[PDB]
Amino acid sequence: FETISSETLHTGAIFALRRDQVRIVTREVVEHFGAVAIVAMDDNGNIPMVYQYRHTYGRRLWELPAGLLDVAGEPPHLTAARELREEVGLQASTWQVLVDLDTAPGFSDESVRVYLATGLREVGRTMGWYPIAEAARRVLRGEIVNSIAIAGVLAVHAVTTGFAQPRPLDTEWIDRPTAFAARRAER
Amino acid sequence: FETISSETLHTGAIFALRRDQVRIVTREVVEHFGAVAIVAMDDNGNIPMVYQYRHTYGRRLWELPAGLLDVAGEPPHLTAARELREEVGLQASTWQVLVDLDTAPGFSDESVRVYLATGLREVGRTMGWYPIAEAARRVLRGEIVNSIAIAGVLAVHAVTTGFAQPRPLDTEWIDRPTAFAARRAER
Ligand SMILES: Nc1ncnc2c1ncn2[C@@H]1O[C@H](COP(=O)(O)OP(=O)(O)OC[C@H]2O[C@H](O)[C@H](O)[C@@H]2O)[C@@H](O)[C@H]1O
Ligand SMILES: Nc1ncnc2c1ncn2[C@@H]1O[C@H](COP(=O)(O)OP(=O)(O)OC[C@H]2O[C@H](O)[C@H](O)[C@@H]2O)[C@@H](O)[C@H]1O
Known part of the structure; x- marks a missing residue:
């Protein structure tokens, strides 16, 4: 795969819309800060x-x-x-x-x-x-649908049932966003 | 809460970007088709x-x-x-x-x-x-990160362990998207 060209369509408060040409297919991407939950x-x-x-x-x-x-x-x-x-x-x-x-x-x-x-x-x-x-x-x-909540809730449940273990803070975060932050379209 | 005004910022292949004024706060929304997984x-x-x-x-x-x-x-x-x-x-x-x-x-x-x-x-x-x-x-x-996969995998696991039961096809889908489909910005 390969990105041929990127073009910014919009920069908003919490995200930016970008459109790239790939390997050739149009691929629109919403650049986000990333988030954390507890x-x-x-x-x-x-x-x-x-x-x-x-x-x-x-x-x-x-x-x-x-x-x-x-x-x-x-x-x-x-x-x-x-x-x-x-x-x-x-x-x-x-x-x-x-x-x-x-x-x-x-x-x-x-x-x-x-x-x-x-x-x-x-x-x-x-x-x-x-x-x-x-x-x-x-x-x-179906009383909890937020995808982040679903993941965290079921995961801690897997942990409380002894099926799984929590991990170290330094565990690598493979897809931590960087693009939008790289923009710093502020001030 | 209340939507004061909606303005379409972009209409793409699989989604549209819209910005609304709420109750007053700017709220940009990515309208999507919705999807299904198995x-x-x-x-x-x-x-x-x-x-x-x-x-x-x-x-x-x-x-x-x-x-x-x-x-x-x-x-x-x-x-x-x-x-x-x-x-x-x-x-x-x-x-x-x-x-x-x-x-x-x-x-x-x-x-x-x-x-x-x-x-x-x-x-x-x-x-x-x-x-x-x-x-x-x-x-x-962390070898499976796709949020849909996480939800489905952990859910069927909860089912296989006897902790939970599958539901009827006619179960209500509360947040099934409709906006982008309503646009039908094609042909
Ligand atoms: N960002 C994009 N921009 C333009 N076209 C896109 C984009 N992303 C996907 N497409 C396209 O839509 C078609 C893919 O359709 P599906 O196979 O029906 O669905 P899929 O992309 O796999 O998504 C199903 C679900 O999984 C993902 O987690 C995604 O978030 C979605 O809910 C692709 O062939 C291509 O046209
Ligand atoms: N669509 C939006 N458009 C403009 N501003 C927005 C929008 N959505 C949220 N905001 C704003 O960003 C600020 C909220 O910040 P946080 O409390 O840090 O985060 P939150 O919106 O709760 O999101 C955390 C996470 O949960 C959600 O599932 C979301 O998908 C995200 O990953 C709000 O006060 C407001 O400025």
Whole structure:
């Protein structure tokens, strides 16, 4: 395969649309920052989820706390730690990589890294807490559709059932986006 | 929330970019056809996966057979059955709904319905067959990152472990896209 020519069609707030000519096929790509999400498991197997309105679907979806990697030069897990704090007011002593997902492989370069945070502490001073098994059932029942939440929930479930293990923070993130950040079309 | 005004920024081959003013915030949306994917489980718990090049990431990813809902007026499962046939040369007697996922909730209206096909028959006349547990381990190991594949693989795994059940074809698909299809910007 080979990119013959790239042409920027639009640069927006959180993404840019680009069209390339490949190997020859037209391939439009949505350049994204990439994002991080957190499955914060407490000492009793419960994780917090937020209920956020998504204009794309015109309704509120149940999701894991998450945020865009829109801070040039900021380490993903630091981005993640801030989001966990800002979103559900929790600080965690242990951080590991749970699952990375390529959200829309067909038209965007967005990739999302999902962390597993443990050893939680309520700091500072709508959302809900769900036992992992319950969250897993909400997924297979279609009550949780956000793709990032699906991946994180089912993954931590696989971990809690002993089927799988969390991974090291330094695990390589193969498809971490870079293009849109490279643009820095701001200021 | 409320959409004040919509403005089309671009209409491409498989999607359109639109920008709306909300409740007041700018919200750019990628209108998509929606797609369907298939977890085809054989009589021994193995499922077929394809290894397809994704220009967005510049590499080949392991995925479930899948296709866009680009056939105006075609039922999703029929779309799905054609793809299973065309992709891995299999016909299945039983079709159920496994999991629906909203791929990129933050910038696209794309939603994907994942079916579970059983009672397989090799018809007609690269890909590979993976025992479900192995596929599940490839996910938690980061060897399977496609979000649709992650959802389908972990979901069928939850089903094979007895934790969850498949659902009826008539299960409601809450976020099935309609906007881009409504455009019919062709011919
Ligand atoms: N389509 C959009 N157009 C313009 N601005 C947008 C759009 N979508 C979100 N924004 C904005 O970016 C900011 C939201 O930032 P975050 O809270 O960091 O992230 P979030 O939108 O929740 O997304 C995290 C992740 O979840 C979603 O599933 C999304 O696909 C993404 O990977 C919002 O306040 C707003 O400025
Ligand atoms: N970014 C693109 N720009 C222009 N055309 C594209 C693009 N991406 C794919 N196409 C095309 O659409 C056709 C592919 O159709 P399908 O085989 O029906 O579907 P597919 O691309 O595999 O996607 C199915 C699903 O998987 C992906 O994860 C993608 O996010 C989507 O939901 C290709 O032959 C080609 O015309």
